[PDB]
């Protein structure tokens, strides 16, 4: 059934699983037409498919051409997501296929279940967790490869960089979700925290800066403060 606070450590056991987030698949800018009506212009999107144990992020870039001549795009986007996830699973060796796929929004359950009828042993599950994966497009290198794509494309990143050499996947996932929650709540502030110190750089294959253990503690503290801050600014508390 639904993943929640009580069964949280299941994410980090040795049963292969993937999260799938569809919140950046169909993206638009809204603007005024010469006649003063409103129209949308789609921009490139992405499916966010993540193995929380290993950090394996399979980023399927959704090029705007997949929407051409199509109706009801918000509904199509859920089925296109399910189609691409299904294709990904079928492309993996049997022993790499997930035993569970956790969708971050319940409207993905039926589209994915229907696309995965050939895999009766893969469990499709919702979650009661409010995960901040929509903020994936605030990571500069991910946003860059999405917006530069001229055709459909799959790109691979470890979203944990090399952290698992030093911390567990439980801890790496906690760090990731803190970082993403911060970027979602105040992107500018979050990015100033992460990048202000010019002596700490981002390695060319990494997504995040090369913080020492001690620096991560400071950064993690600063991100908590930011989130608490905005919570006050927002609610006047």
């Amino acid at each position: 059934g639904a993943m929640n606070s009580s069964n949280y450590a299941e994410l980090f056991n040795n049963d292969i699983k993937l999260f799938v987030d569809d919140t950046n698949v169909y993206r638009v800018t809204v603007h005024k037409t010469f006649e003063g009506n409103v129209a949308t212009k789609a921009i490139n999107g992405c499916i966010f498919t993540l193995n929380p144990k290993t950090g394996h992020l399979f980023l399927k870039i959704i090029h705007t051409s997949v929407w051409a001549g199509q109706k009801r795009l918000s509904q199509l986007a859920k089925w296109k997501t399910a189609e691409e996830v299904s294709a990904l699973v079928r492309s993996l060796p049997k022993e790499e296929q997930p035993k569970q796929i956790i969708v971050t929004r319940k409207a993905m359950l039926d589209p994915l279940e229907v696309h995965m009828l050939d895999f009766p042993n893969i469990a499709i599950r919702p979650t009661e967790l409010r995960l901040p994966f929509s903020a994936a497009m605030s990571i500069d290198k991910l946003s860059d490869v999405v917006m530069k794509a001229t055709e459909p494309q799959m790109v691979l990143f470890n979203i944990y960089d090399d952290w698992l050499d030093r911390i567990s996947s439980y801890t790496a996932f906690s760090r990731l979700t803190l970082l993403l929650r911060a970027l979602k709540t105040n992107e500018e502030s979050a990015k100033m925290i992460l990048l202000s110190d010019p002596t700490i750089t981002i390695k060319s294959y990494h997504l995040w800066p090369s913080f020492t253990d001690e620096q991560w503690i400071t950064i993690e503290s600063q991100m908590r403060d930011l989130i608490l801050t905005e919570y006050g600014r927002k609610y006047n508390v």
């Binding site: 199509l76 089925w79 399910a82 189609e83 039926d110 589209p111 279940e113 229907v114 009828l117 050939d118």
Partner: protein, 300 residues
């Protein structure tokens, strides 16, 4: 007109014949039911006064044999049986008719209710759903489960309705996942109609039989089947126009006949609101929508 004579009525019981119900007291001089219209299937059903649990009954067609009911004191129920000796059967039915020991099927010459509820129901198809080939009549009761319910236990005592499952490989063509899930026409027209039922009459027959088992026996699996067969049509964008008009009539008479006080348990709020107000056929069931809105506006 045909007759279902009774050997006796040793235990107090409510007897039902199609949409009608009457009471018989323990050891009352009751010897059965006469003037039963030839040309239709019929159902004779029972609820004991001392254990209203287990409604049970028998689907039969008087053209297929001479049938009578005798209580069995070992198995504790009224059993339908067949007398092959035609001479003997007629000789006995005549004695009962002369002594006026039978109640009369009350068909009133303005009423087409039973025809309209059983138009497509055929005894040959009932006998394939209810497997017990040594008898010409078919036993059904409250507790019998469907082949699909047994998939989600005794196979011999099951209701073999046609399995409908919207999230199944049979319902969904590879490469048309979204199309086939959102518009079930492929599944209705090619898989079910052309492939399994062969024609819409056999489809409507199973739908009607399912409704009646749900209504008369409180058979939950039959209720699920009835609603699934409605939902498959309502969720199809392409349905033969004659099928829609006929479905509207079928459902109208089913809703008209339902006990008002059972509406809470025999009608699925989700299916009906989807069918009348969201589905492709939301504007195609005018008679059904009007009776539903005037009789069960709570549900909607």
């Amino acid at each position: 007109m045909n007759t279902v004579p009774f050997t006796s009525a040793p235990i107090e019981v409510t007897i039902g014949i199609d949409q009608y119900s009457f009471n018989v007291k323990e050891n009352q001089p009751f010897h059965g039911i006469k003037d039963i219209p030839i040309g239709h299937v019929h159902v004779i059903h029972f609820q004991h006064a001392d254990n209203s649990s287990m409604r049970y009954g028998y689907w039969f067609d008087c053209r297929m044999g001479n049938f009578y009911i005798q209580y069995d004191p070992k198995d504790g129920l009224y059993k339908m049986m067949e007398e092959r000796d035609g001479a003997k059967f007629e000789n006995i039915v005549h004695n009962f008719k002369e002594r006026q020991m039978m109640v009369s099927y009350p068909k009133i010459d303005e009423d087409d209710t039973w025809y309209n509820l059983t138009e497509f129901v055929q005894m040959d198809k009932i006998r394939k759903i209810v497997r017990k080939d040594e008898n010409q009549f078919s036993y059904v009761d409250s507790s019998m489960t469907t082949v699909q319910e047994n998939e989600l236990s005794d196979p011999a005592h099951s209701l073999n309705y046609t399995v409908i499952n919207f999230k199944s490989r049979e319902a969904i063509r590879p490469g048309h996942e979204m199309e086939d899930f959102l518009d079930k026409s492929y599944y209705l027209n090619t898989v079910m109609l052309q492939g399994i039922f062969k024609n819409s009459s056999n489809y409507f027959g199973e739908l009607q039989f399912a409704f009646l088992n749900a209504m008369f026996f409180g058979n939950y699996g039959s209720s699920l089947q009835w609603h699934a067969m409605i939902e498959l049509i309502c969720s199809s964008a392409t349905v033969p126009k004659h099928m829609l008009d006929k479905l509207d009539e079928i459902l109208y008479y089913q809703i008209k006949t339902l006990p008002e006080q059972y509406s809470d348990i025999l009608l699925n709020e989700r299916v009906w609101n989807i069918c009348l107000y969201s589905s492709f056929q939301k504007n195609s069931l005018h008679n059904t929508e009007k009776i539903m809105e005037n009789k069960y506006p709570e549900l909607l």
